[PDB]
Amino acid sequence: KEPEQLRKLFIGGLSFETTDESLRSHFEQWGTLTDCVVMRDPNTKRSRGFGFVTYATVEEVDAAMNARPHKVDGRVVEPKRAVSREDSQRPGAHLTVKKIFVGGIKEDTEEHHLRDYFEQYGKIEVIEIMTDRGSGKKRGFAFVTFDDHDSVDKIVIQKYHTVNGHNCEVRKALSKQEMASAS
DNA sequence: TAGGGTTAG
Numbered sequence: 332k333e334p335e336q337l338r339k340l341f342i343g344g345l346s347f348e349t350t351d352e353s354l355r356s357h358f359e360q361w362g363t364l365t366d367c368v369v370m371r372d373p374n375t376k377r378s379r380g381f382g383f384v385t386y387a388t389v390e391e392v393d394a395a396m397n398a399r400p401h402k403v404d405g406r407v408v409e410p411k412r413a414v415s416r417e418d419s420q421r422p423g424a425h426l427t428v429k430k431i432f433v434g435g436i437k438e439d440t441e442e443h444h445l446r447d448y449f450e451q452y453g454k455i456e457v458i459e460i461m462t463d464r465g466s467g468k469k470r471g472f473a474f475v476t477f478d479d480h481d482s483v484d485k486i487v488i489q490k491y492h493t494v495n496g497h498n499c500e501v502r503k504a505l506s507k508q509e510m511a512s513a514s
Numbered sequence: 515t516a517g518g519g520t521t522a523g
Contacts, residue, residue: 339517341515341516341517342515343515343516344515366518368517368518370518373518373519379516381515381516381517382515382517383516383517383518408515411515411516413516416517416520416521417521419517424516425515
């Protein structure tokens, strides 16, 4: 049994009339669920438009993700990798992006080092090892872009990532403006 | 479209 958090998916944009029932009936197509709930307001008991589904294996959730789009109760919904309550705390951790910030890479780090490790998550579109302006000095971090936003999510949820022989930190990419709003 | 009486004795 892999971790619960890694076996659950967040389902967004659910139709107001979606119930654990319907939710379950749909996603069981890709495997055995072990949890399936529609979140709603404690008082009006009215749906909040989102819910979670959990399978018995991460392999099965991978199967479901490869199955997008997902239409439930006549409404295209949006499945995502469930982000731990704790990380949901972090600045813009729920936004949908295709680019990732990779911090703490060695000076001799080259592009192949990043491809080496990152390709296993999805089609890479761009790699950028940031250097200093006019200085040309390596800055110890980079940006990697993918075709699927899920490739990024499949990553940010893992805790460790080894690039060029050592662990490095990975976070969703935020625009210069988002950074400032965060700070 | 970010969690269910689920976070410091």
